[PDB]
Design a protein around this ligand. Structure first.
Ligand SMILES: CCCCCCCCCCCCCCCCCC(=O)OC[C@H](CO[C@@H]1O[C@H](CO[C@H]2O[C@H](CO)[C@H](O)[C@H](O)[C@H]2O)[C@H](O)[C@H](O)[C@H]1O)OC(=O)CCCCCCCCCCCCCCCCC
Ligand code: CLA
Ligand code: CLA
Ligand code: CLA
Ligand code: CLA
Ligand SMILES: CCCCCCCCCCCCCCCC(=O)OC[C@H](CO[C@@H]1O[C@H](CS(=O)(=O)O)[C@@H](O)[C@H](O)[C@H]1O)OC(=O)CCCCCCCCCCCCCCC
Ligand SMILES: CCCCCCCCCCCCCCCC(=O)OC[C@H](COP(=O)(O)OC[C@@H](O)CO)OC(=O)CCCCCCCCCCCCCCC
Ligand SMILES: CC1=C(/C=C/C(C)=C/C=C/C(C)=C/C=C/C=C(C)/C=C/C=C(C)/C=C/C2=C(C)CCCC2(C)C)C(C)(C)CCC1
Ligand SMILES: CC1=C(/C=C/C(C)=C/C=C/C(C)=C/C=C/C=C(C)/C=C/C=C(C)/C=C/C2=C(C)CCCC2(C)C)C(C)(C)CCC1
Ligand SMILES: CCCCCCCCCCCCO[C@@H]1O[C@H](CO)[C@@H](O[C@H]2O[C@H](CO)[C@@H](O)[C@H](O)[C@H]2O)[C@H](O)[C@H]1O
Ligand SMILES: CCCCCCCS[C@@H]1O[C@H](CO)[C@@H](O)[C@H](O)[C@H]1O
Ligand SMILES: CCCCCCCS[C@@H]1O[C@H](CO)[C@@H](O)[C@H](O)[C@H]1O
Ligand SMILES: CCCCCCCS[C@@H]1O[C@H](CO)[C@@H](O)[C@H](O)[C@H]1O
Ligand SMILES: CCCCCCCS[C@@H]1O[C@H](CO)[C@@H](O)[C@H](O)[C@H]1O
Ligand code: OEX
Ligand SMILES: [Ca+2]
Ligand SMILES: [Ca+2]
Ligand SMILES: [Cl-]
Ligand SMILES: [Cl-]
Ligand SMILES: [Fe+2]
Ligand SMILES: [Mg+2]
Lengths: 65, 504, 38, 37, 81, 57, 342, 57, 39, 38, 34, 34, 34, 30
């Protein structure tokens, strides 16, 4: 294959195909972030939906003048 | 050979040519943006932002330019109605040109990457086979996206180094591009607060930078690597398509309901504003405040801006169009010229009467007039023989306050009836139907068209997600199942755990 | 106790008759009391 | 330049041509009324 | 087969029917009483035949406000004297 | 004149129809269940006005 | 690597009478609640406060007229959660406000997700290609377009279909009168896919059944087949000749035949879904402009298209006051559109 | 067979005003809404062809 | 401040968590009690 | 019209006669297997 | 030999128990008069 | 609420009766699984 | 009739473009070595 | 122009029927 200056510079960033951490690794941490993100989406959805209604938060064109 | 629907699969193990095909796609999209902006500039009439704004003229990319701060033409005009403005290079024309040149450079890069496909960069150093390290690539790209998202937020939207964004008053009368500070309290999650858009790009930008660094530095767990087939580029296609249909549903929704990023001065008003008489309530409030301050009826109504009256008209309601009724809103009811003023109907007893407005559901609707307490007082009858509410029987008249017909009164049944028929549409306007040969049939706005296209494309992309996820997780059987599939593997009870040969 | 003592054909017959009876009751109810139009 | 080993011939058999043409033509016969409006 | 006792075994056994000749009529009677005592009406808020309208009213009790809807239903209910 | 009330309905392409609106229109209510072949008409113009093509087809 | 996850995985995939799976955790509760909500609502729950209708067995409705009806128009697109701001944790009030409608719609949606995940999971365990799930994408596009996107585009959940036989019939007629839905080429493609699918089902079944090889002595021919047999049970060659001579063309490739049987009804349903997304926005195929210009100028010009529009106008005027009670429509007799005598 | 028996006017189930309260007020069901739609269709179809109050074919 | 709807939100979140947790506790327990036989 | 009518009657008669005399020309024997069905 | 309380037992009863209850309720309804 | 007791009482006696007939085999099934 | 003036070319290209695509693929399949 | 278009598409379809039946690739038993 053809080498080039730039390809030589970028080589290390494409040299670890298939490399994995043992077992479950950071899955538990990932799960937690997924759970937080689900709740964040439910919050913003319920706000837009007026199912969750917060003081100072007027979901309307008449929010701020 | 390959069937027609598989021709592009030749790219799966050829990162150079895949990059070339992507460069070519990008070139075509940038080229589209350039061409679209040019067509719109060649057809847009900037002379009346009150009764002929961009959303009445079928403008689709112009409001997206305006939304982020491009409001002027090299020709001297601006979308807010100013004269003698100098926009610098970044006028609508400059944006279009920039997109064309970008398109060109991308095309050339595509050619280079297509010829010189066999770069050593694309080979796995240990096997010599083509390979992309997708997890690290995801980190790299996420980091980049994070820096850009953050930059956009902290510099562009804030006006720190940039123009800001389109903002307006609650009735879409005084819109302009303004610098916007981030909103860090709970109101940042209010769709109608622009400060939340700012805050979002700052915070999510930061989170993108952090997650990016994580994904650059930390390898996937073996179990997730295997489960999601992280060695197969089609897994990335599957999940990317999922993310994309999610984003598309969200933009369709925020376009339909409105938010700080889908302003009515750029896309037209929403159907819900007609549904709840939003503009009518504001108009009546203003008129009452004037009356209470000692104004005459004529003065009260003459004090209503034409733009505001224009919002209170069903011809601008995005839920009144048709799938094959093509073009700009102007092609239907015509190009709006002037507010006729507010029509007040009275019967022979001098009681004020109110025309029943058309709900969006109805292509056609009767003409029925009630008193302030909803009692029917007059109508236009179908069968005449037992009519009791005809305008003729009831002596219905109509007087105008404000607008072109201000101070005038009409008593002849044909005229009164004509105005009543217009009154079902809300406030009444004079239109030029000749310039464009308008056919008098309602069309939706860019709010409508955008919403439609994006809900449909999102729904289709769901199928895309299902198809590619399936191809990813069932790669081993996509030319068929094992010819030697033992019957006992699908026979009930033989294995304790379905399809697990260790559990006989 | 052990499966078999009560012949399956009798079970099917009795169950079926039961089904017929209840649906019959529902059709009677179409003509009397609520929903009867009377 | 060395040839690309990922190239593949493409095919469309006659039945597929006929099915394709029937699809396009019927789709046209259907949508044309709406294009003319 | 997947390990569980065949249905045809079960429903032709004496024990099944010793249990179910009690359990099946009991449930049926319970459902009957749920209606006959009038409990169902109160649980689900379904109008009895004499509770759709007040004596002289002929207008439907339609809910017209989202956030005070509960109070509106309570008011409609109060209006049946 | 599908309903026999001298109110002719246009079904053909050349007379203002598209593929979606077009039709061969049922024979006249004045005819009812009577057999109306071409030779029962005084002329093809008559046959056509009364919806003869429908019965033939 | 034998941790709790793998042990649970073991349990979930036991070859038992009703397969569970990881997908079962989503599917079973959601499907059960959706069916239970419908049975519960149609048996006991009114629509007096939301629609001014009786809708349950308790009130005197029959199987054809029971329904779980949509919430009042004033609820907008409220998720209408039991603990939400509308019902405030009050179960009786929740039923009276139409909470069972969103309960059923939402649990049903997650249940359909569960079922398609089940099709994937089982395909993967057994080792077959996942075309059954893929084909199930069409029911999903239909449910999502009709029960969610369509009313989300309109004023409120009120205009979603209500869950009941007659209620659905009302949905059909409403779509005719207000949307002219039969005129829509997306609906039309849907019709072609459904009827074409039914046609393929029938013709394929009958063809197989009538080109059977005699593989046994009996005059009832079902027993002369064995699941494990390698041989085709009917003659593709004879089938092919018969159809080539009858209809001019015939299948010759069984794999293509079966794929086509997937393709036709799945594609049809997908097209119908697209048209409904348009109707969410009233973006209808309601008119042909050329027709209307000609007709408006020429009082002798009449087509089946104009006739159908007069029918639609009748539907809107005569059905609206009772079908849309929140609008408080009062249409005096004299304004009602009517032909002579009727 | 539905079409072929409705041909002789044995029609769909009719539950118009089947549900009635204690006083005798009509309590509408979805069947009655269907009825209103059907009325729109009925009163509009063939707008010039009927001279008498009942459409008997 | 905690509005009645934010309180309600909390209640719904807690209810969901409880249903999910109870479900998984039970499934895990049963999975532990009734293990598959392997060679 | 009369010429048209006679013509059409003759055509119809011709084909109907073909149908009838045709199905009378030993049709059960026109099959691939057991022919002697008289 | 065979277990009694299985997953199948549970599924069967989650359907059959409310069904018989519901059928008793609907039966009682047939005797309600306005 | 007396109506609630009147309705649940049938089901309760049903449950209790089915436990009486199946308890010996239930304890055998469970003590086998363990 | 006052039809849309783009309908003719819309229809023509709608037919022509994909049909030509299919014809190109068909002919070059045929010309491949038998 | 419209009528010509509709009739033309139709005509192409009938021609296609002709080719698809009489000039199909013959089915061959391998
Ligand atoms: C593929 C299949 C995959 C499998 C299926 C999985 C199913 C998952 C379940 C998802 C449930 C979604 C709930 C959406 C609720 C909603 O939308 O609720 C609607 C609310 C908006 O509320 C509405 O807002 C309207 C307009 O109000 C505004 O305008 C008014 C008039 O001036 C006033 O000013 C008012 O104060 C102001 O708020 C009215 O008030 C309505 O009554 C009110 O319901 O949006 C919101 O919550 C959020 C809006 C943005 C996000 C929407 C994305 C999701 C839905 C995409 C569907 C596209 C719809 C477009 C149509 C095509
Ligand atoms: C405090 C800092 C901060 C602030 C003030 C904001 C502010 C905002 N965020 Mg951001 N965000 C932040 C940090 C912040 N963010 C961080 C750190 C992250 C993680 C990187 C995000 C990730 C994020 C996401 C993923 C989204 C937002 C969105 C928003 C906007 C929400 C209002 C809205 O229009 O919702 C509208 C959107 C919803 C209500 C979400 C609906 C979710 C759907 C219903 C789930 C189901 C999808 C499925 C396909 C639906 C199919 C069914 C249907 C078709 C029937 C608002 C500008 C939303 C947005 O972009 O709006 C335009 C959005 O989607 N943010
Ligand atoms: C997101 C996509 C999108 C959207 C929402 C808009 C929106 C708009 N465009 Mg723009 N435009 C776009 C992309 C878009 N455009 C592209 C890609 C081009 C290049 C061709 C253009 C070029 C363009 C021009 C030249 C003009 C517009 C105009 C407009 C305005 C009028 C729209 C209209 O009448 O549509 C009508 C929409 C339809 C008739 C829908 C067609 C649906 C197809 C036919 C369905 C096909 C079904 C399929 C074949 C079935 C396959 C079945 C098989 C799978 C089994 C509107 C604001 C007009 C304007 O007013 O400018 C000022 C105008 O003159 N646009
Ligand atoms: C990011 C989006 C994306 C990308 C990069 C791909 C990429 C791929 N798809 Mg997937 N797919 C997607 C989204 C995507 N798809 C979506 C949204 C759907 C549902 C519509 C599908 C449904 C799908 C199926 C059923 C199949 C694929 C297949 C493929 C592979 C071969 C495609 C090919 O050779 O077609 C060649 C295409 C042509 C020669 C002509 C297509 C003409 C189209 C149909 C009409 C005109 C399209 C127009 C130019 C598009 C304008 C842009 C649009 C956004 C408006 C390729 C890896 C195939 C595969 O898996 O091979 C193993 C395959 O069978 N895709
Ligand atoms: C397991 C499958 C399943 C799924 C997917 C759903 C889904 C749904 N249910 Mg259903 N339901 C289920 C089983 C399920 N249910 C069961 C088994 C029952 C019987 C108890 C019910 C009874 C039920 C009722 C009575 C209602 C619903 C409703 C709903 C909807 C609203 C749910 C919600 O907002 O949760 C919010 C909670 C979560 C999403 C939990 C997320 C878990 C997080 C990530 C963990 C962190 C929690 C945190 C640490 C706790 C802090 C709490 C503290 C601050 C107080 C949603 C569609 C509502 C509805 O349909 O309205 C129309 C409704 O009224 N469900
Ligand atoms: C609305 C509130 C929501 C909260 C939800 C929280 C509850 C959890 C939800 C899931 C409940 C699943 C119940 C079904 C499992 C079961 O009954 O197994 C029955 C098991 C296994 O029996 C055995 O049956 C086995 C076969 S099988 O597993 O039943 O298929 C067999 O292997 C074995 O020999 C036999 O003893 O016996 C038990 O001891 C389970 C304990 C009871 C729980
Ligand atoms: C005896 C009941 C007959 C009912 C009417 C006919 C049903 C079957 C006809 C369908 C034709 C399909 C095209 C040919 C399909 C075809 O070729 O069939 C072939 C198939 C198999 O043929 P065999 O030659 O093996 O057997 C038929 C004879 O030769 C006798 O052995 O025929 C049958 O299975 C007959 C079944 C009789 C019993 C069927 C009852 C099914 C319906 C029961 C009533 C339900 C009504 C519900 C209303 C709510
Ligand atoms: C080379 C070069 C250059 C140039 C460039 C250029 C000139 C470019 C252009 C470009 C362009 C100019 C492009 C364009 C594009 C476009 C597109 C890409 C489009 C597409 C479209 C579509 C795809 C559509 C579709 C559709 C239809 C048609 C109908 C309706 C529906 C839909 C929408 C689907 C320069 C000098 C700069 C420099 C460098 C070199
Ligand atoms: C909603 C809800 C819920 C749930 C509930 C449930 C889950 C329920 C279930 C329920 C059920 C589960 C019920 C059932 C029922 C059943 C029935 C009612 C049946 C009937 C049947 C019949 C009547 C039959 C008929 C027939 C047929 C079908 C065919 C054959 C013949 C005959 C005619 C016999 C909860 C609490 C969670 C929460 C709150 C809300
Ligand atoms: C109203 C329409 C006229 C109705 C008349 C009905 C009258 C009933 C008797 C009709 C005469 C039947 O005459 C019938 O036709 C021809 C005449 O050569 C005979 O001849 C036929 O015999 C063999 C039978 O294997 C055929 O293969 C052969 O092609 C043909 O020649 C039939 O064997 C004879 O049975
Ligand atoms: C592609 C050709 C490049 C032509 C560049 C013209 C620059 S034009 C120049 O730009 C400045 C920033 O926009 C403005 O401040 C200034 O008013 C304007 O005249
Ligand atoms: C590639 C050739 C295109 C070169 C176009 C350069 C436009 S440059 C542009 O010109 C305007 C004059 O009206 C000024 O208002 C503006 O400030 C200036 O940037
Ligand atoms: C004889 C009619 C006298 C009253 C005038 C009609 C109502 S107002 C009228 O409405 C038209 C659309 O129909 C517009 O095109 C026009 O601009 C406007 O004058
Ligand atoms: C979602 C699944 C997250 C698994 S978490 C995983 O679980 C194993 C046992 O199952 C442990 O041994 C391991 O340490 C832990 O990281
Ligand atoms: O024709 Mn046709 O439609 Ca059987 O009803 Mn009578 O007629 Mn007429 O009216 Mn209704
Ligand atoms: Ca004109
Ligand atoms: Ca009484
Ligand atoms: Cl008619
Ligand atoms: Cl008459
Ligand atoms: Fe088959
Ligand atoms: Mg009764």
């Amino acid at each position: 294959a053809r080498r080039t200056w730039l390809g030589d510079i970028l080589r290390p960033l494409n040299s670890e195909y298939g490399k994995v951490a043992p077992g479950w690794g950071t899955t538990p941490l990932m799960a937690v972030f997924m759970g937080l993100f689900l709740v964040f989406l439910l919050i913003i959805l319920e706000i837009y939906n007026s199912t969750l209604i917060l003081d100072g938060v007027n979901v309307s064109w008449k929010a701020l003048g | 050979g390959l069937p027609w629907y598989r021709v592009h699969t030749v790219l799966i193990n050829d990162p150079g040519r895949l990059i070339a095909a992507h460069l070519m796609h990008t070139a075509l999209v940038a080229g589209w943006a350039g061409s679209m902006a040019l067509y719109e500039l060649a057809t847009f009439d900037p002379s009346d932002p009150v009764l002929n704004p961009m959303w009445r003229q079928g403008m689709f990319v112009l409001p997206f330019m305006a939304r982020l701060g491009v409001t002027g033409s090299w020709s001297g005009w601006s979308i807010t109605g100013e004269t003698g403005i100098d926009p610098g290079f970044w006028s609508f024309e400059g944006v279009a040109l920039a997109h064309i040149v970008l398109s060109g450079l991308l095309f050339l890069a595509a050619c280079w990457h297509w010829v010189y496909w066999d770069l050593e960069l694309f080979r796995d150093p240990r096997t010599g086979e083509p390979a992309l390290d997708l997890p690290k690539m995801f980190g790299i790209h996420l980091f980049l996206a994070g820096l850009l998202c953050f930059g956009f937020g902290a510099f562009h939207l804030t006006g720190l180094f940039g123009p800001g964004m389109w903002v307006s008053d609650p009735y879409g009368l005084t819109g302009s591009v303004q610098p916007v500070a981030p909103e860090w309290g709970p109101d940042g999650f209010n769709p109608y607060n622009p400060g939340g858009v700012v805050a979002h790009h700052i915070a999510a930008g930061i989170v993108g930078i952090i997650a990016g660094l994580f994904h650059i530095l930390v390898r996937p767990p073996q179990r997730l690597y295997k489960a999601l087939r992280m060695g197969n580029i089609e897994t990335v296609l599957s999940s990317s398509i999922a993310a994309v249909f999610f984003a598309a549903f969200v933009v369709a929704g925020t376009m339909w309901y409105g938010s700080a990023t889908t302003p009515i001065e750029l896309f037209g008003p929403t159907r819900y504003q007609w549904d709840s008489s939003y503009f009518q309530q504001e108009i009546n409030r203003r008129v009452q405040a004037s009356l209470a301050s000692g104004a005459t009826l004529e003065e009260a109504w003459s004090a209503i801006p034409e733009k505001l009256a224009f919002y209170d008209y069903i011809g601008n309601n995005p839920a009144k169009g048709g799938l094959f009724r093509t073009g700009p809103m102007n092609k239907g009811d015509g190009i709006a010229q002037a507010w006729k003023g507010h029509a007040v109907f009275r019967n022979k007893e001098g009681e004020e009467l109110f025309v029943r407005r058309m709900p969006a559901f109805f292509e056609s609707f009767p003409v029925i007039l009630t008193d302030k307490n909803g009692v029917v007082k007059a109508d236009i009858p179908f069968r005449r023989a037992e009519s009791k509410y005809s305008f003729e029987q009831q002596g219905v008249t109509v007087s105008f306050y404000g607008g072109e017909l201000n101070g005038q009164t009409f008593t002849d049944p044909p005229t009164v009836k004509s105005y009543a028929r217009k009154a079902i549409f809300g406030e009444i306007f004079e239109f030029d139907t000749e310039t464009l040969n308008s056919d008098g049939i309602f069309r939706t706005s860019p709010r409508g068209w955008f919403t439609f296209a994006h809900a449909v494309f999102a729904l289709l992309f769901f199928f895309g997600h299902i198809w590619h996820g399936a191809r990813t997780l069932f790669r081993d059987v996509f030319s068929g199942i094992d010819p030697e599939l033992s019957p006992e593997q699908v026979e009930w009870g033989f294995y304790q755990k379905v399809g697990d040969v260790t559990t006989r | 106790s052990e499966g078999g003592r009560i012949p399956l054909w009798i079970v099917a017959t009795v169950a079926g008759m039961g089904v017929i009876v209840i649906v019959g009751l529902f059709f009677y109810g179409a003509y009397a009391g609520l929903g009867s139009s009377l | 330049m060395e040839p690309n080993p990922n190239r593949q011939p493409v095919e469309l058999n006659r039945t597929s041509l006929y099915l394709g043409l029937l699809l396009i033509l019927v789709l046209a016969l259907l949508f044309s009324s709406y294009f003319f409006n | 087969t997947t390990g569980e006792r065949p249905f045809s075994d079960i429903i032709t056994s004496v024990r099944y029917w010793v249990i179910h000749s009690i359990t099946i009529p009991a449930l049926f009677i319970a459902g009957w009483l749920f209606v006959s005592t009038g409990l169902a009406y109160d649980v689900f808020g379904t109008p009895r035949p004499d509770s759709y309208y007040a004596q002289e009213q002929r207008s439907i009790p339609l809910v017209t406000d989202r956030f005070e809807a509960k109070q509106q239903v309570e008011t409609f209910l109060e209006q049946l004297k | 004149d599908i309903d026999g009330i001298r109110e002719p309905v246009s079904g053909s392409l050349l007379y203002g129809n598209n593929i979606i609106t077009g039709a061969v229109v049922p024979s006249s209510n004045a005819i009812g269940l009577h057999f109306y072949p071409i030779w029962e008409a005084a002329s093809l113009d008559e046959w056509l006005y009364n919806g003869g093509p429908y019965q033939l087809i | 690597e034998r941790g709790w996850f793998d042990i649970l995985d073991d349990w979930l995939k036991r070859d038992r009478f009703v397969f569970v799976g990881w997908s079962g955790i989503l599917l079973f509760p959601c499907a059960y609640l959706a069916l239970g909500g419908w049975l519960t609502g149609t048996t006991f729950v009114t629509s007096w406060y939301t629609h001014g209708l009786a809708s349950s067995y308790l009130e005197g409705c029959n199987f054809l007229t029971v329904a779980v009806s949509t919430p009042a128009n004033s609820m907008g697109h409220s998720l209408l959660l039991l603990w939400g701001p509308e019902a405030q944790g009050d179960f009786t009030r929740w039923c009276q406000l139409g909470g069972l409608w969103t309960f059923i719609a939402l649990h049903g949606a997650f249940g359909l997700i569960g079922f398609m995940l089940r099709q994937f999971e089982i395909a993967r365990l057994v080792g077959v290609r996942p075309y059954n799930a893929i084909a199930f994408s069409a029911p999903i596009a239909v449910f999502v377009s009709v029960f969610l996107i369509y009313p989300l585009g309109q004023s409120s959940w009120f205009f979603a279909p209500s869950f009941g036989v007659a209620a659905i019939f009302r949905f059909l007629l409403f779509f005719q009168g207000f949307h002219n839905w039969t005129l829509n080429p997306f609906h039309m493609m849907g019709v072609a896919g459904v009827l074409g699918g039914a046609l393929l089902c029938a013709i394929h079944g009958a063809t197989v059944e009538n080109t059977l090889f005699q593989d046994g002595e009996g005059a009832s021919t079902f027993r002369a087949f064995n699941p494990t047999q390698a041989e085709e049970t009917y003659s593709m060659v004879t089938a092919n000749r018969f159809w080539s001579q009858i209809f001019g063309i015939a299948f010759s490739n069984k794999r293509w035949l079966h794929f086509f049987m997937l393709f036709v009804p799945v594609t049809g349903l997908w097209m119908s879904a697209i048209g409904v997304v348009g109707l969410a926005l009233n973006l209808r195929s309601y008119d042909f402009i050329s027709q209307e210009i000609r007709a408006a100028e020429d009082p002798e010009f009449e087509t089946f298209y104009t006739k159908n529009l007069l029918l639609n106008e009748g539907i809107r005027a005569w059905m609206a006051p009772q079908d849309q009670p929140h609008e408080n429509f009062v249409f005096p007799e004299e304004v009602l559109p009517r032909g002579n005598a009727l | 067979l539905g079409i072929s028996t409705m041909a002789f006017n044995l029609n769909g189930f009719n539950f118009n005003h089947s549900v009635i309260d204690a006083k005798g007020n009509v309590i509408n069901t979805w069947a009655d809404i269907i009825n209103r739609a059907n009325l729109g269709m009925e009163v509009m179809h063939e707008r010039n062809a009927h001279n008498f109050p009942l459409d008997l074919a | 401040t905690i509005t009645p709807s934010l309180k309600g939100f909390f209640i719904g979140l807690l209810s969901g968590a409880v249903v999910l947790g109870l479900t998984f506790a039970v499934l895990i327990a049963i999975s532990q009690i009734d293990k598959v036989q392997r060679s | 019209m009369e010429t048209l009518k006679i013509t059409v009657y003759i055509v119809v008669t011709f084909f109907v006669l073909l149908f009838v005399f045709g199905f009378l020309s030993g049709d059960p024997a026109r099959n691939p297997k057991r022919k002697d069905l008289e | 030999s065979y277990p009694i309380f299985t997953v199948r037992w549970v599924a069967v009863h989650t359907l059959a128990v409310p069904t018989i209850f519901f059928l008793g309720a609907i039966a009682a309804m047939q005797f309600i008069q306005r | 609420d007396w109506r609630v007791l009147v309705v649940l009482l049938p089901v309760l006696l049903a449950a209790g009766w089915a436990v009486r007939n199946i308890l010996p085999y239930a304890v055998k099934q469970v003590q086998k699984l363990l | 009739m006052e039809v849309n003036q783009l309908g003719l070319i819309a229809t023509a290209l709608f037919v022509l473009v994909p049909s030509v695509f299919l014809i190109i693929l068909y002919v070059q399949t045929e010309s491949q070595q038998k | 122009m419209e009528t010509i278009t509709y009739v033309f598409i139709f005509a192409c379809i009938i021609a296609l029927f002709f080719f698809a039946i009489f000039f199909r690739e013959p089915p061959r038993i391998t």
